[PDB]
Design a protein around this motif. Structure first.
Motif, PDB file in Angstrom:
ATOM      1  N   UNK B  17       0.825  -1.209   0.000  1.00  0.00           N
ATOM      2  CA  UNK B  17       0.000   0.000   0.000  1.00  0.00           C
ATOM      3  C   UNK B  17       0.860   1.260   0.000  1.00  0.00           C
ATOM      4  N   UNK B  21       9.277  -0.470   2.179  1.00  0.00           N
ATOM      5  CA  UNK B  21      10.424  -0.540   3.066  1.00  0.00           C
ATOM      6  C   UNK B  21      11.602  -1.165   2.325  1.00  0.00           C
ATOM      7  N   UNK B  45      15.622  -4.968   9.545  1.00  0.00           N
ATOM      8  CA  UNK B  45      14.947  -3.825   8.938  1.00  0.00           C
ATOM      9  C   UNK B  45      15.766  -2.539   8.909  1.00  0.00           C
ATOM     10  N   UNK B  60      21.072 -18.163  15.469  1.00  0.00           N
ATOM     11  CA  UNK B  60      20.120 -19.172  15.924  1.00  0.00           C
ATOM     12  C   UNK B  60      20.611 -20.571  15.587  1.00  0.00           C
TER      13      UNK B  60
END
Lengths: 226, 156, 202
Positions: B17, B21, B45, B60
């Motif tokens: 929309x 990013x 980010x 991880x």
RNA sequence: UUGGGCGUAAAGCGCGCGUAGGCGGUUUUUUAAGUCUGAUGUGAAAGCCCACGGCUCAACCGUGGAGGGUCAUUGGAAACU
RNA sequence: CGAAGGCGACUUUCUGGUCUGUAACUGACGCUGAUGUGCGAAAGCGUGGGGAUCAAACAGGAUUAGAUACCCUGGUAGUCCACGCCGUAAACGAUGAGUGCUAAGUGUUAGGGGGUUUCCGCCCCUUAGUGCUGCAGCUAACGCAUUAAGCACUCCGCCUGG
RNA sequence: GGUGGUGCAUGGUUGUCGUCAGCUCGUGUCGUGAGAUGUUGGGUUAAGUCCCGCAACGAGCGCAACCCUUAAGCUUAGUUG
């Protein structure tokens, strides 16, 4: 403690499974034969390797590893839950939302969510919590405490479990394998031998299986704890 | 025991929309330089934050390389799918012997004696695959010679 | 973008009215004496970046009621600017003795007049992100009610503003007595209009 | 080969049916003809190892050994032929 | 089932061949590939039919504010079978044909071993397949897989810019 | 000082998608990637608001009987009503 008794193991329903072509060539290391379809455990490592599972939990509970005895079958929603409680844990009698631990780290929050929403319904000022709130709180409570019980109050993690049909209930095991934990289990036929380090095709009908092993493992986190 | 190194980044910008990013989805190698080169990935980010928010996901699971130090004495390579590399062992007294993108991961595991026949596909994400294929499928020498029934050098 | 300009949001609980005005005679000239004086301090307070509007005319013994709580500009030193206006703003109001001022507590938290505090963060267009627009990142998360931020002040000649989003979530999102206001200012686009629409969220 | 594949992407046949063939499964066994010749006379330059001299450094030149450790020459014999 | 295009009324044929249970038996006696094998559907295709049906054309109609068109009987051939085929289809498997598996499963046509024989049926082994999924593998993913879009031994052809 | 012209130089002025009841957002989290949560499969009131079963938990954004208003008392009382 270590072993199961042999009679209600054998005759009161561990060896039985389901019909052939629901076939487990992968659990052949513990499957003996089949009686017109209905499988049979190899009836020796159902006790010997059960003692080895006890020893696997011995140096696991001697450092604080209490196994969650899980509610999957219908006697497990009550009695295996109950020996989880005998071990000093809670139970799991509700369903995954579909990937809580393979998509781990957002509704892996449900551990803290049950630690908090239950304790807030329990603590003082429950009267101050109004009835408009209590409606949804009590509509959710039946789903909440039954959601997660392994890390409920024994808020460390179990280094094993005791599954029956990980053919479906690997939703817990396989999704938690992201978190790198071994599992033992008293499995059913045509289920997983891989994720579970100790599988025995134990039909659930022998409650001796859940008492003199799994509640005996509630006892092995006392003797195999001290 | 793993290896510290930056791998790459990527600015994801999806048809959405509002403004797209540019999350710097980054993969990083982390550790303290033993030989067991453990990389990982991450979807993160912010410009200064996404390095660490992606190394969060990288560590991880960061993989092991059971490393025959000095050099893997024989031809050492691997493959998965469209990805693969090759390493012909050469003398260790040669300086750094490497390829184009595999140069800094050649320095990660301490061998610095084999060359880097830079083979594989042209796929950037699976460039990591082609790289890690070469050194993920390894097994030591003495343990294999033991495993094969004979001694460490009865088979030599 | 076919949007009207609001002023009052949810008036009746949160939004209030500071009407304490008693200058009853001469709605043509005495009204002028307290409204046209509002056309005066736009320049002097040096990027005031102020809180809200609290006007008050004390029974026609008018002491001017506009705070602009950045100190020094309206204080002086123990009644320098205020006592000076005691003689100067006799042309503004009747007496205007010792004009007042407040202390501003995180003025970027005030919903309405924050627009100056951010119009003076990118109107410079020269190091307009760190030297000036530091405060978009300082004044972020003090928990203001109206959570909406945008900036449009002369970025390449932009005739619209900016927004930032991500996606998830669940809530009972209906609330009916919040507080927020507008923002619109006087930058020069030179070909097609845009007065910068500028808010932030604390 | 070493250092490409062919569904989509560089490319896999309406089709199948067919002779030489390529390859079709071999189980044993004899030769030394080939499957890192033995060791040496043994080796093209800007081009098999070092020594060199001059090169304003260089620019560039050449020299000897190593003549090789590289072909010939001698060999016969597995668990394939 | 055939070399395919493809193969459809049935009594029958050869039951050729598939086909699985037996396979009674001399000693590599085969896949692909010089040979050579044939055709391949129709549009169209070299004779009576053929305008009988259907059918282009024409007629003739008109939507609501529009035909001769969606519409077509008479009807142009054509359609079509008793004498000649092309080498073309989404003949597509976009995926060439030998030795064998890839946890395997799966219910099942055939043919069998059978137990139980049933009342011709329940249970086990079964394969050419039949499907279904599903292990490994597969490619980017589409998605393929005990019967490929995998795995180790055969050939073929293709192309590494178009 | 312009009325002579340019909103078009920008404050603006503002009609205007559109009351869209919707627009959403974090902690985030899965899809190797081109893609995935909310406000739910069975049944309930003025503003995207849920339970037995679904990847969710946490805030806003436009807008509570919101404070009037109609009212039942009063209250205040005779002041002017």
């Amino acid at each position: 403690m270590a072993v199961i008794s042999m009679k209600q193991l054998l005759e009161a329903g561990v060896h039985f499974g389901h019909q052939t072509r629901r076939w487990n060539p992968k659990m052949k290391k513990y499957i003996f034969t089949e009686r017109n379809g209905i499988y049979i455990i190899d009836l020796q490592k159902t006790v010997k390797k059960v003692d080895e599972a006890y020893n696997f939990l011995k140096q696991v509970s001697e450092d604080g590893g209490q196994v969650l005895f899980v509610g999957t079958k219908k006697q497990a929603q009550e009695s295996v839950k109950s020996e989880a409680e005998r071990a000093g844990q809670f139970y799991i009698n509700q369903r995954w939302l579909g990937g809580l631990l393979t998509n781990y780290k957002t509704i892996s929050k449900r551990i803290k969510r049950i630690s908090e929403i239950e304790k807030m319904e329990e603590d003082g000022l429950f009267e101050v919590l109004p009835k408009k709130e209590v409606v949804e709180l009590k509509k959710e409570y039946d789903r909440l405490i039954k959601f997660l019980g392994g890390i409920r109050d024994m808020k460390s993690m179990p280094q094993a479990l005791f599954v029956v049909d990980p053919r479906k209930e690997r939703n817990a095991i396989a999704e938690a394998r992201k978190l790198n934990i071994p599992i033992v289990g008293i499995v059913d036929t045509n289920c997983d031998p891989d994720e579970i380090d100790y599988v025995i095709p134990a039909n659930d009908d022998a409650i001796r299986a859940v008492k003199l092993l799994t509640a005996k493992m509630a006892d092995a986190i006392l003797e195999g704890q001290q | 025991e793993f290896e510290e190194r930056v791998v790459t980044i990527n600015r994801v910008a999806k048809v959405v929309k509002g403004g797209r990013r540019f999350r710097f989805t980054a993969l990083v190698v982390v550790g303290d330089k033993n030989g067991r080169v453990g990389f990982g990935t991450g979807k993160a980010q912010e410009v200064p934050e996404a390095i660490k928010k992606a190394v969060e996901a990288a560590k991880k699971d960061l993989v092991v390389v059971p490393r025959v130090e000095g050099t893997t004495p024989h031809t050492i390579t691997g493959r998965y799918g469209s990805g693969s590399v090759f390493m012909k062992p050469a003398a260790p007294g040669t300086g750094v012997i490497a390829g184009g993108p595999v140069r800094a991961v050649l320095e990660l595991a301490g061998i610095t004696d084999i060359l880097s026949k830079s083979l594989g596909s042209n796929t950037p994400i699976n460039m990591v695959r082609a790289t890690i294929d070469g050194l993920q499928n390894l097994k030591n020498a003495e343990d294999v010679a033991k495993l094969r029934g004979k001694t460490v050098e009865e088979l030599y | 973008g076919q949007k009207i300009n609001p002023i009052g949001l949810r008036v009746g609980i949160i939004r209030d009215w500071e009407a304490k005005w008693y200058a009853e005679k001469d709605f043509a000239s005495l009204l002028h004496e307290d409204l046209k004086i509002r056309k005066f301090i736009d320049n002097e307070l040096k990027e005031a970046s102020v809180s809200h509007v609290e006007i008050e005319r004390a029974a026609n013994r008018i002491n001017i009621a506009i705070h602009t709580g950045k100190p020094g500009m309206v204080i002086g030193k123990g009644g320098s600017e205020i006592e000076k206006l005691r003689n100067k703003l006799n042309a503004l109001t009747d007496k205007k003795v010792h004009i007042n001022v407040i202390e501003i507590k995180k003025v970027d938290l005030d919903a309405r007049l924050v627009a100056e505090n951010i119009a003076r963060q990118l109107e410079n267009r020269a190091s307009f992100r760190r030297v000036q627009k530091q405060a978009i990142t300082r004044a972020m998360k003090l928990g203001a009610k109206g959570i909406k931020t945008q900036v449009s002040g002369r970025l390449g000649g932009a005739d619209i503003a900016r927004a930032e989003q991500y996606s998830e979530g669940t809530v009972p999102l209906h609330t009916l007595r919040a507080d927020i206001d507008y923002a619109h200012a006087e930058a020069d686009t030179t070909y097609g209009k845009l007065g910068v629409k500028v808010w932030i969220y604390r």
